[model samples]
Target: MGHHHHHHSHMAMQEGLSPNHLKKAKLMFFYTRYPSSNMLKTYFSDVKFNRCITSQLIKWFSNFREFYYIQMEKYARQAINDGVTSTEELSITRDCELYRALNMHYNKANDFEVPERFLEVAQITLREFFNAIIAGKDVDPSWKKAIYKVICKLDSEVPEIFKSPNCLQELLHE
Candidate 1:
């Protein structure tokens, strides 16, 4: 998912002049990285998914995969050391504290600090996430970011532990 390319505003999606060939290729790979014959033909505008074109598509997609895992591996180590999952938060000292301050300033609250759900997600605890990295066991560190993002999203979705805003206000320091 980290390597996913944008299909949102590409020209090929529209019927205008350009067709934005590069983004079209990206959209095609996004849906069908292991592509079908017609897919390459339809999007690429070549002899339609031939060995030469197909090989290049695979190679390009392959390059993204390599780069993706390399980043995952790098961030996995970073999270283990820092205990802060998202890259923008960096090492979670002054920067992360400021990040929290900004979020609270906007009224969103630092609700990621709250574990509203008790269940483990598609991956285990962040500690186990680091454990997997230590063993080089399996899965990508995409989970590293996933667990962080998912918790934030899930926190917003669930019912509050208490119905009273006073308690939440006290806790959030609102």
Candidate 2:
């Protein structure tokens, strides 16, 4: 009974923030979890991200990750009770904590066009993407950039923020 979702729409409106700005925040909620500047530039455009806003997004994603990470341990132990170590060995119900928590945050429909299923897949595959990045072993930007490209194509609806014809290179960190 403790589940809760923060609707930032009215909260931002009351503070005179562009309610639409939350679109960027939500999209970044997925991106910053990977903690990549390349992801930000490719999605938002070559333009630099706002230091203050990015700070907020990064911190919030950190909090969300902690909750998700904690659930993995719970699910893992439950799997172990049956002498099973594989995740598939773990039996779960509709109320499964990790699935519910992920859906609560990742399953949103808004002007941002990334599919909810795709976002959830992205979250699971991040360990692969991030490991490649850290090893400098290809750091093949294509995988996540594919999501970046997909979001841009549907501009008939959702807005693109950083876009330019010959985009400027944005370097915020010294």
Candidate 3:
């Protein structure tokens, strides 16, 4: 139980993504509806925030944020105190869409252009992890670095797009 709870938090903390920042990132998901996976790719690239998808993204983002950051953070913290390792022992469940959002962060860091090797590794990891999920296998949240941190990164970066919200979009047609 200890391990299962803390796995994701431990990995995230190790990467210097603190819990407070995690909270902020998770909150950002609520800013829009859960767009189709394709829209997510676009939003990640430019953060254009299509109105059509905003509402769904907002709801889905809220749901998953509560799951990944709020609840999971507590569990991960407990697992760390117990010095637990290995997802098998912890039996943590993963939220896949949230994880994909995290991975989008990594690709974004590389300028929204993922290298072949990175994509390969991501595909393999996703295949294995999602397969486990489909099979009802417990996830080792700590081992979810590939997806979790990336989402964390993405979560962190997204607010910048709106930070300048009051700025002009077309410079007054001068």
- Screening candidate 1 with a backbone cut-off below 3 angstroms (N, C-alpha, C), the clashing residue pairs are none
Error of 3 at 56 (Å): 3.9
lDDT of each: 0.41, 0.41, 0.39
Q: In candidate 1, where is summed lDDT lowest over 10 consecutive residues?
A: 8-17
> Per model, how many backbone clashes are there?
0, 0, 18
**lDDT tens digits, residue span 3-61, model 2:** 22344422221222243544455555443323244444465563344655544554444
Over 4 Å off, model 1? 1-21, 28-47, 81-131, 134-136, 139-174
Q: How much is the lDDT of residue 23 in candidate 1? A: 36
Q: For candidate 3, lDDT tens digit of each residue in 129-169?
A: 44444444436554444434433333333432333455545
Q: Extract clashing residue pairs from model 2.
A: none
Candidate with top TM-score is 2
Cα lDDT of model 1 overall? 0.41
| Model 3 CA deviation exceeding 4 Å by range | 1-53, 92-174
TM-score for model 2?
0.37
